[PDB]
Amino acid sequence: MEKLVQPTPLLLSLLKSAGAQKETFTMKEVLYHLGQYIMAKQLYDEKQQHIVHCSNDPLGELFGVQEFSVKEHRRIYAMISRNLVS
Ligand SMILES: CCOc1cc(C(C)(C)C)ccc1C1=N[C@@](C)(c2ccc(Cl)cc2)[C@@](C)(c2ccc(Cl)cc2)N1
């Protein structure tokens, strides 16, 4: 299996709210649940659906931004990385 990561508490709370029922993940799983979270809460822009609006949301605190594009993979990996236990 791919490497296992441990989300810090704030990220863990987000992943669980999206439906995760464990505390240890592969990066693929973290990405999956983040997508599910964004979709369920409809944080994406209705007309430009690759844009995520995350002000007034834990995701914004986690990523340190008010908006981002799902196309920004390197940035998203970095934002996730600062929310994993080293
Ligand atoms: C929630 C919407 O997600 C996506 C939407 C679209 C459309 C433009 C077709 C709308 C396209 C792709 C996506 C889309 N890209 C993915 C695959 C992605 C996988 C890896 C990285 Cl590093 C980044 C993104 C994923 C799972 C995602 C979105 C957001 C986050 Cl924070 C995490 C995962 N969703």
Side-chain angles (χ1 to χ4, degrees), residues 1-7 11 15 22 24-35 63 73 76-85:
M1 183 169 49
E2 187 52 51
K3 64 89 51 65
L4 297 170
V5 301
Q6 176 186 356
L11 177 58
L15 299 174
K22 58 187 181 183
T24 308
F25 303 87
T26 64
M27 180 61 36
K28 180 276 172 185
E29 289 179 320
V30 176
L31 292 169
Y32 168 80
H33 290 298
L34 281 166
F63 281 13
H73 285 204
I76 290 166
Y77 282 123
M79 293 185 289
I80 294 173
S81 292
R82 55 179 166 188
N83 289 289
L84 301 176
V85 179

Side-chain angles (χ1 to χ4, degrees), residues 45-80:
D45 194 88
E46 59 176 342
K47 296 180 174 184
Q48 304 299 337
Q49 298 191 356
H50 52 286
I51 301 301
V52 179
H53 298 289
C54 49
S55 66
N56 190 31
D57 196 274
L59 181 57
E61 183 178 348
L62 285 166
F63 281 13
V65 302
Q66 292 183 293
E67 273 96 16
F68 65 96
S69 170
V70 301
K71 306 192 175 189
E72 301 184 80
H73 285 204
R74 185 261 293 163
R75 288 191 188 178
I76 290 166
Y77 282 123
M79 293 185 289
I80 294 173

